[PDB]
């Protein structure tokens, strides 16, 4: 419900952030305070029905998408998915999979790495 | 109803029935009603 792709900074300027009945600042305070660690870095945001949308939230462990962007060594948007640009290897693939080791609900190294390739071969890098 | 002499399924839910030996169609789409197929 209302997937939210926002940084770790201000939770005020999100129009789709407050659409299920939740207010803006009442969480934004603690959101900023506890996400000052990675302010300027993305932190995905989703929500579930609490009882009446008085206050609820859940922050997601970051999937490798900004690190997967620099895995291609390009800071430009990837409208070219069949082009293998950037270097990724089993060592780097496993390092990336460490991030998503807890991020996914099916737990095993090979399958999580297959997730990383499947999301990454379409990233704009035909990964190893 | 649309005055024509050859009607074929034009929306995905335009199904053809024959009422009293007059061929007509039924569909949710209201721009797709016609008879005398």
């Amino acid at each position: 419900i209302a997937k939210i792709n926002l940084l770790g900074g201000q939770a005020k300027p999100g129009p789709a952030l407050a659409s299920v009945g939740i207010n803006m600042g009442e969480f934004t305070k603690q959101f900023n305070e506890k996400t000052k660690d990675k302010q300027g870095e993305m932190i995905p945001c989703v929500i579930t029905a609490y009882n009446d949308k008085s206050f609820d939230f859940i922050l997601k462990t970051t999937p490798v998408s900004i690190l997967l962007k620099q895995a291609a060594k390009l800071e430009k948007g990837a409208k070219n998915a069949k082009t293998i640009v950037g270097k990724i290897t089993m060592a780097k693939a496993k390092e990336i999979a460490q991030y998503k080791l807890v991020d996914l609900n099916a737990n095993t190294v090979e399958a999580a790495l297959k997730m990383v390739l499947g999301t990454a071969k379409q990233m704009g890098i035909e990964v190893i | 109803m649309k005055v024509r002499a050859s009607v074929k399924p034009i929306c995905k839910d335009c199904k053809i029935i024959k009422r009293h030996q007059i061929v007509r169609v039924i569909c949710k789409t209201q721009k797709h009603k016609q008879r005398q197929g």
Binding site: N105, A106, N107, T108 | -
Partner: protein, 126 residues
């Protein structure tokens, strides 16, 4: 194919005969998200939360020497946890599922191939 149906029935008969413990409890709405939550909890357990047809589970059970002829006529979504290789932790998880629903009646199965009353099997589970 019907011959394929028979050979699959034989294969799952062999599977249940080989497997000592196994529990199949009918779920309303067995949910995939909480299913893979179970999968994280089970991890590399010999158990495999799985979903196969309910008629094959009749003829599997009636080929594979386990008690109950009218106990197989369950109606609805059925998923079997084959308890083995940490069968206890599988029992723990399936009783956690028992407490995750309204109240799920004992359909079939037991800890290691000897079914009895289910007022204590859940206590082995927790």
């Amino acid at each position: 194919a019907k011959k394929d149906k028979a050979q699959q029935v034989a294969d799952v008969s062999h599977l249940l005969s080989t497997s000592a413990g196994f529990v199949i409890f009918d779920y309303t709405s067995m949910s995939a998200i909480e299913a893979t939550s179970i999968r994280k909890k089970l991890f590399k357990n010999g158990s495999k939360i799985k979903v196969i047809k309910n008629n094959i589970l009749r003829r599997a059970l009636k080929a594979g020497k386990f008690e109950g002829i009218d106990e197989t006529a369950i109606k609805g979504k059925l998923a079997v946890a084959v308890g083995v290789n940490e069968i206890v932790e599988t029992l723990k998880a399936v009783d956690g599922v028992v407490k995750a629903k309204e109240a799920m009646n004992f359909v079939c199965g037991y800890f290691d191939n000897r079914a009895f009353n289910s007022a204590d099997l859940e206590k082995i589970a927790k």
